[PDB]
Swiss-Prot record:
Disulfide bridges in this chain: none
Keyword annotations: Cytoplasm, Nucleus, Ribonucleoprotein, Ribosomal protein
Localization terms from the record: Cytoplasm; Nucleus; Nucleus, Nucleolus
Miscellaneous remark of the record: There are 2 genes for uL6 in S.pombe.
Gene3D superfamilies per UniProt: Ribosomal protein L6, alpha-beta domain
Signal peptide residues on this chain, from the entry's feature table: none
Role summary: Component of the ribosome, a large ribonucleoprotein complex responsible for the synthesis of proteins in the cell. The small ribosomal subunit (SSU) binds messenger RNAs (mRNAs) and translates the encoded message by selecting cognate aminoacyl-transfer RNA (tRNA) molecules. The large subunit (LSU) contains the ribosomal catalytic site termed the peptidyl transferase center (PTC), which catalyzes the formation of peptide bonds, thereby polymerizing the amino acids delivered by tRNAs into a polypeptide chain.
Name assigned to this protein: Large ribosomal subunit protein uL6B
Family: Belongs to the universal ribosomal protein uL6 family.
Length: 168
RNA sequence: AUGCCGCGGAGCUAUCAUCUGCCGGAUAACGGCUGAACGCCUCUAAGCCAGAAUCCGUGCCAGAAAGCGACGAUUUUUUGG
């Protein structure tokens, strides 16, 4: 199990920290999670476990997934498409904030502050579709999770989500 | 031993009269995200949000009489400093 390094992505290990770089920016999140020594040769990251336990076997795979998620997000998008199935649904807000309106006839207007690095384009190319863009899958999906979690039906049909993808 | 009666200012008093009585964080159950384990899946193992009249705070009351700070003047030509 060895994970390589792209042409231009500069991963640096500073006390279980990762600070990959790219044209999309710097994707750095704290990684105080893995108790496994990390070997970096400058082009490929190697994970070696010396007489580890079952938790070590979980740590190596989780670390590989996290670094794989970051290596996907160095310069590629994590666009998350939604679906507005329904009294109609309208979303009018600027910046990195998303507000709901006419949610099943409720007069209230739910307000959600998107996580940093998440861009909303309020696309009108396709019907009842809103996409969430970013480089960090964790932040993008957490923002999408918060958007859908606040859109819940109590004592009712319903509202569902759409697929994922990559942009740029 | 306030003789009795009507009204009676002031005071007191009446849910018999009038005025006033907020929002921040952390959570429980629970719901999600990135995600392994157990080559997949799954909220959980690390981590992150949301979330109760809950808990702790802001506000309100008292002020350690052995907690503290800033400021003011320092027995008058007798005397004390």
């Amino acid at each position: 199990e060895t994970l390589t390094i792209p042409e231009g992505v500069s991963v640096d290990i500073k006390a279980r920290l990762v600070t990959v770089k790219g044209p999309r920016g710097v994707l750095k999140q704290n990684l105080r999670r893995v108790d496994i020594e990390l070997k970096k040769q400058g082009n490929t990251i190697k994970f070696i476990v010396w007489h580890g336990s079952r938790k070590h076997n979980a740590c190596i795979r989780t670390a590989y997934s996290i670094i794989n998620n970051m290596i996907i997000g160095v310069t590629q998008g994590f666009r998350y498409k939604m679906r507005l199935v329904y009294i109609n649904i309208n979303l009018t807000e600027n910046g990195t904030v998303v507000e709901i309106r006419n949610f099943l006839g409720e007069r209230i207007t739910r307000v959600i502050k998107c996580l940093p690095g998440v861009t909303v384009s309020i696309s009108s190319a396709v019907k009842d579709e809103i996409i969430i863009e970013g480089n960090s899958l964790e932040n993008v999906s957490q923002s999408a999770a918060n958007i859908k979690q606040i859109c819940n039906v109590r004592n009712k049909d319903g509202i569902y989500v759409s697929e994922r993808g990559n942009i740029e």
